[model samples]
Target: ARPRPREYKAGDLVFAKMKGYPHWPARIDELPEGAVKPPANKYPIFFFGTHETAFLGPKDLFPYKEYKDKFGKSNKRKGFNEGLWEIENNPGVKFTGY
Candidate 1:
């Protein structure tokens, strides 16, 4: 089974969801001041090794381990067949989320 969803915090290293499968390396810019539920109408800030912080939400974030699982390729090839599996995994699931 998969591990519990990670509780992210500022300065934590993780992978920020990208335009495609897998994610990009990033640093947590800020965790919600109080209790914040991911993608629960809450957006979090992240730094993708760039000057400006990536303005994303919980849906745009992922655990490094799961990201690694999805993109196991050393090169830029679609390893683990994520291209097909991603959409297939969630059948009939409408994503009205971020």
Candidate 2:
């Protein structure tokens, strides 16, 4: 049997992945009153480095350290640079509280 979807809340930090992109840090946010309607199975999340918003499934969200512990070494071996640079240098992303 398949596992049930995990519960998520606004302000929860998770890693979200886009096609051809590394797993990036993301924060869950509640859909605003005037926000676009999302698909039934998805939630709104904001990418950390890009500050881009997307509707993503629970399956697409992973806890931060879970990913780090599982994929960290392999990602580094693959020469994947984490998105820290984007978080620091991207004009659209502000790392104020972080």
Candidate 3:
């Protein structure tokens, strides 16, 4: 009804799920031009551990703080070396991904 408006914004921390991977914590990085047209998977999310960037739909993105409580597992990327502590220690951290 709202013309497919996005519920998130840049710099907002969230959890996203990808193919063959569990839901991982990430940050909403940017909004591309003509974002409203897609109406799905509009947000470009930046992953903490692997530094990967990908687009996610509204239903696939969840709040970061409640990730563990909601998923019943910590959002840590095995073998990626980064953990929740990295994000927890660096609130408002800038992630200029390559």
- Which one is best on TM-score? 3
Runs in model 1 deviating more than 4 A are 1-7, 20-22, 31-43, 72-98
Estimate, for each residue in 1-98, the C-alpha lDDT of model 2 and write its tens digit.
54534767666667777788777766677665666777886877777645677888888888655565553332441223434443234523432323
TM-score of each: 0.43, 0.62, 0.67
State the lDDT of candidate 1 residue by residue for 1-98, as single tens digits. 76535455555445566565345544455544465355544445443323234456566666545665563343453332332233234311222222
Q: For model 3, how does the per-residue alpha-carbon lDDT over 1-98 read when each residue is reduced to its tens digit?
A: 33323588878777677888777767887665654554465677777666677878777887777565664265445723364554566634555431
Q: How big is the positional error of residue 11 in model 3, measured in Å on the Cα after superposition?
A: 0.8
Which 10-residue span in candidate 2 carries the lowest summed lDDT? 71-80
Taking all chains together, the TM-score of candidate 3 against the true structure is: 0.67
Clashing pairs in 2: none
